Design a protein around this ligand. Structure first.
Ligand SMILES: [Mg+2]
Ligand SMILES: [Mg+2]
Ligand SMILES: [Mg+2]
Ligand SMILES: [Mg+2]
Lengths: 732, 726
């Protein structure tokens, strides 16, 4: 191809620098809004004091998280090393390659180390970019609320700039760190590109492993705090739970999504390299083709930068009616730009033809067909988000049909909205099915991997809009609580409901991008374990498959009780707060926020530990006791039945949110029809909302790690399961 | 070569069937000796008359469609199985043995159709007669509460045992009769004999699509027609229309479903074994081993039934039902040991995907046994998760002291965790079955679960009767002593019929798979690769179908309950005398509008189940349909268990508070408390999941297979019409 081995390695890390640079420019412009148009004073001081308490509890949350993360990340690094060393008997003797039997590779010990290096790198990059994101989110929240004094547009812009910092840091870092890791490892591995990219494969697992904390644990917290909206018998800052939630608004949708998307990005990029490593590109050693996934991802930053400027600088917002589109336009602009962008990348850095591995054979693949495989992914993303919009927006028919149920009952609001989520799934599945059936065809599993990266090429703006959402729930709450001009409070609540419609898409975007990555890994694991058939007939698989299909249902049952309990742990903790501290319950003194967070945040991560086991140990148990053939069936069942629950769950929970937020909004005859702000309908809608609060933000999103992480886990430990397979079959 | 000879089998079978029949007649007869101060006895009669006007309005408004469909689909089955051989009359070499000659393929097509019609006609009959004992014996329970608990409960449980035996014998007898009228043609073509007999299974499962989806939507469209504005009061026609509903759903629906589950597992045994030792050689009493296992079931359950009629407080009642189960499980292990001894050779071969595989008859006996003891374990694992008695429902009651949001969250939690142990129970059954026999094992082990279907159905059919007994008391304004007696049965009925809901879904996954394997055995596929996208897109979209099919049964029953509140305004506002006091509401009409509404709401989910084989099987291959049939199984079984158990809890949590019979139940439980209101918002969310969206779900799994088994030659012959074009 046209772009040379230099060209890739001088391009990649420019575009990641440009990314990080962009981000720090945007941060600098949000710093320009110091905490003339001040009107009046003392509400500014009141904002400040709420914004502080946000960080008190935010920076609390993180340190209580890390208290387990270091413990976990070492414990596992050991564990990953032992299990990867033991295939070779920790031999220092160069093994003949597990692909081209003839030529000689490095020892699977020296990958046991190099896997355990990248595992730290990844788990640190997920960590850091989420820290930086938590840090900007807590910065911008009041500096938006404030800029709402000046007007809707001027606020939005200095809120979506903030959200952009998160996307571009997260994406750029994940690209940069990976890019470095490849070049530092390529030093030791030399020409053994197969062996090299089996060790990069840990980076995928590292970010995903972390994602388990950020999205399952932090999820269990965020909605513990939200569902910690409990009397008998006192929404005031004087309730620390209230401000524990506004912290959560940031956690479950910045760290939460960010970790999952970083996960979904990284572990897709590894499954794309491990097929191409044992394909044409990696066999011949054609850097700018191995690293095509990165060339794709690196243009993606460049593209998304440009498309971000349409909503930041060229066009600018006037009316609130224009706001929810401006977000959605971004999505189309990028999708559209990226198709042109990745049309060039395909042209300029792939050879016209090559072979792509699958199950022994080298498949022939013309390089336009790889363009179709990212494109199909690119555009299924755009589709699957919009199908979602429809099912989870008060704009469209079906959310309003739910709102009309809460007239008749609270039992009806919930019934109609269970049914809504259930019916949501159809288009996202068929959409996936098509993106598979295109992709499996053109390239093989490398196509499916490419296609998952396809969904995630746009991942800066994709994140930015997801990141914009919780900034505006804080901006909202910082106005409510600081008690501001009803003019301002309307301008925030505008950004709020727009972000609400937007962050349902966000969950959608992810639950498909998962299934695509959790499939990419799955076959890239089969391609490690050297399986070539998986008979649903042969009972070794089927029993594993039916049990695999059950695991999300079980896993869910944990994440459900987890949040339900820990919210009751929050209630008991506020009861304490009032009944120990003096001047709260009176009103002289405030509560201790930091402690509300900590005491609740542990009780979450504790509650996370069993779900986390079921994710992490299912492969180790199944893979040891029964073969890789049986773990194969498990990983398939977890996939098929799991993605269903994930969609239906977080769509029902978005639907009910916006049904309640619709009644509240009163922006139609019908909304007003149901919607006195505390009406009989509003009760049955808001009963519905809190049931959704978990489904939306804890149970459904957690699900897309159970699929993802089980796969990278197995991919990594495929050697170990191959070398010590059915121990329960060895004895019998 | 089998001890009990081919005469001895054929003479034994329909004795048992008729012996069950004769026991059911005897049991209906004894429930007639209960003849129906004053003005309360006529109150009860006034209700019992009105129950029958509603139920018999429903059934007749359903059969408006059942005939219309059965004939239309009969057209369709013949035309499709015909076109396989070009509607040819000239006999064709046997697919099971290339040497010998089989009958012409439209001989199967005609004969499939005959058996399809029989099976529908038996499902229809067994449900019709089942109603006509529930409707009859509901008040005769309430009245007999005037003679205590154990004298009411007996004359209730009998009424359900009648239907359980009537159903059991009828299905066995009609299959048996069909086999001999069919052998009459096929002769030595035992493969092509039992190829037609499987229509019976498709017949029985289609009438479950009417019974427990249409009748499903109705049963809990009425129950959730419990709605203000404005106002148990019989001047509201929905109040009674539900007492018909409590009957229809768990009599006609559980009848039809477990008749279906039975038929299609027995058919799936027959097909497999027709191309194995037994049916290659032509050894009847070894082929018909399924039917011998069944027929002893009747006899074992007849004995056990008498433990809860002749041979033995309100605290005593729930055990009465849980013994009825354990008894006939312990009996039937001996019962089937006998059947396996006296009707099986030392050793044999079973067809799995080409190879005639070594199987020794004791290994076959372990297959019914491992199936038998799954079906015992699985429903006890239910009980634990759906009973006010045990811990996890008592947790859900403590939820409603906090939120009504919390009641539902911790219920959605409940059912989700519910699944784990039943899934291992089903999986452990699978691994042991496939080992010992192969596909025959699974199919036998599914019959192992349904070997106790006589008494199994009795406890499922006692349930709703004793809801009507609790409500016939309430509406007839009876003695408070009497109300605390009938409502005692009601509550143990709520436990028991929740167990039977897990029993059925247990059975289902097993039989769905017995069929799946048999569909692969007919289609001649040696593999089903999860790698090949032909199957993967199948598999993922199979997992999607139940979520779709739920969304429909859900919003069906949702708006259908709101159509029932619409119709109750019309009766109050058009009839002279109602709203005042003069004239009671027309019950026949309040069922009519609601029933059509339900069966019209049914028709699109009833379509999703029915076309999907056809569209997949035609457009794409039997490869793809193999994919789709494995996804819908593994996924839909989870959603099936999650629903009915999530619902079964919230009901029993409400019914715990209402009961108030322990200090903790008093703790939450003023009979309209802050808690009780949250607990009941639970129940009315659980009503569709209880008796509509979860129990229909198992017919999506079941019927998609039998339909696919029957049309598998047509799908091979004119298969991937899209793969073929490119
Ligand atoms: Mg909020
Ligand atoms: Mg909320
Ligand atoms: Mg009732
Ligand atoms: Mg009910």
């Amino acid at each position: 191809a046209i772009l040379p081995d230099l060209g890739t390695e001088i391009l990649i890390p420019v575009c990641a620098v440009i990314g990080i640079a962009f981000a720090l420019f945007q941060w600098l412009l949000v710093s320009k809004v110091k905490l003339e148009g001040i009107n009046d004073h003392n509400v500014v001081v009141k904002c400040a004091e709420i914004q502080n308490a946000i960080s008190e509890g935010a920076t609390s949350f993180l340190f209580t998280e890390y208290k387990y993360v270091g413990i976990f990340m070492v414990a596992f690094a050991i564990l990953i090393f032992l299990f990867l060393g033991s295939v070779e008997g920790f031999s220092t003797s160069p093994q003949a390659c597990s692909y081209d039997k003839t030529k000689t590779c490095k020892p699977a010990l020296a990958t046991a180390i190099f896997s355990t290096v990248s595992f730290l790198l990844g788990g640190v990059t997920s960590l850091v970019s989420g820290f930086l994101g938590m840090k900007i989110a807590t910065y911008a929240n009041a500096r938006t609320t404030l800029e709402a004094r000046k007007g809707v547009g001027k606020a939005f812009i200095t809120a979506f700039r903030s959200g952009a910092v998160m996307g571009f840091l997260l994406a750029a870092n994940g690209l940069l760190v990976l890019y470095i890791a490849i070049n530092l490892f390529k030093i030791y591995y030399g020409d053994d590109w197969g062996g090299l990219f089996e060790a990069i494969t840990g980076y995928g697992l590292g970010g995903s492993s972390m994602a388990l904390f950020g999205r399952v644990g932090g999820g269990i917290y965020t909605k513990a705090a939200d569902v910690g909206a409990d009397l008998v018998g006192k929404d005031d800052p004087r309730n620390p739970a209230v401000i524990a939630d506004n912290v959560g608004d940031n956690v479950g949708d910045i760290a939460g999504m960010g970790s999952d998307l970083f996960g979904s990005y990284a572990e897709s990029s590894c499954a794309a390299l491990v097929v191409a490593s044992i394909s044409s590109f990696g066999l011949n050693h054609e850097l700018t083709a191995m690293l095509y996934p990165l060339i794709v991802s690196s243009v993606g930053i460049l593209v998304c930068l440009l498309t971000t400027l349409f909503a930041t600088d060229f066009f600018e917002i006037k009316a609130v009616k224009e706001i929810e589109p401006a977000l959605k336009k971004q999505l189309v602009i990028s999708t559209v730009l990226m198709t042109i962008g990745v049309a060039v990348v395909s042209f300029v850095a792939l050879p016209t033809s090559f072979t792509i591995f699958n199950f022994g054979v080298q498949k022939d693949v013309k390089s336009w067909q790889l363009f179709l495989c990212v494109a199909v992914g690119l555009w299924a993303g755009l589709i699957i988000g919009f199908v979602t919009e429809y099912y989870t927006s008060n704009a469209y028919s079906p959310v309003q049909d739910v709102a009309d149920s809460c007239r008749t009952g609270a039992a009806t609001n919930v019934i109609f909205g269970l049914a809504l989520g259930y019916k949501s799934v159809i288009i996202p599945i068929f959409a996936i099915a098509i993106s598979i059936f295109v992709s499996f065809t053109f390239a093989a599993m490398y196509g499916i991997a490419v296609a998952a990266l396809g969904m995630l090429s746009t991942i800066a703006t994709g994140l930015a809009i997801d990141a914009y959402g919780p900034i505006s729930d804080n901006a909202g709450g910082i106005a409510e609580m600081a008690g501001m001009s009803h003019r301002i409070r309307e301008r925030t609540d505008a950004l709020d409901a727009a972000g609400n419609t937007t962050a349902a898409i966000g969950k959608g975007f992810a639950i498909g991008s998962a299934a695509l990555v959790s499939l990419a890994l799955f076959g890239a694991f089969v391609s490690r374990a050297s399986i070539t058939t998986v008979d649903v007939l042969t009972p070794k698989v089927f029993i594993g498959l039916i049990v695999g299909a059950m695991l999300p249902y079980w896993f869910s049952a944990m994440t459900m009780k987890s949040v339900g309990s820990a919210a009751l742990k929050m209630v008991e903790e506020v009861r304490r707060q009032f009944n120990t501290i003096p001047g709260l319950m009176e009103g002289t003194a405030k509560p201790d926020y930091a402690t509300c967070v900590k005491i609740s945040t542990d009780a979450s991560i504790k509650e996370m530990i069993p779900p986390g086991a079921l994710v992490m140990l299912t492969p180790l148990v199944v893979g040891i006791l029964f073969g890789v053939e049986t773990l194969s069936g498990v990983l398939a069942g977890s996939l098929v039945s799991g993605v269903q629950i994930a969609i239906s769950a977080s769509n029902t929970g978005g639907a009910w949110d916006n049904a309640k937020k619709y009644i509240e909004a009163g922006a139609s005859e019908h909304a007003r029809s149901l919607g006195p702000k505390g009406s009989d309908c509003h009760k049955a809608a808001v009963i519905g909302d809190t049931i959704g609060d978990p489904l939306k933000d804890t149970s459904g999103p957690s699900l897309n790690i159970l699929i993802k992480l089980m796969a990278v886990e197995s991919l990594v430990f495929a050697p170990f399961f191959a070398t010590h397979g059915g121990l329960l079959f060895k004895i019998f």
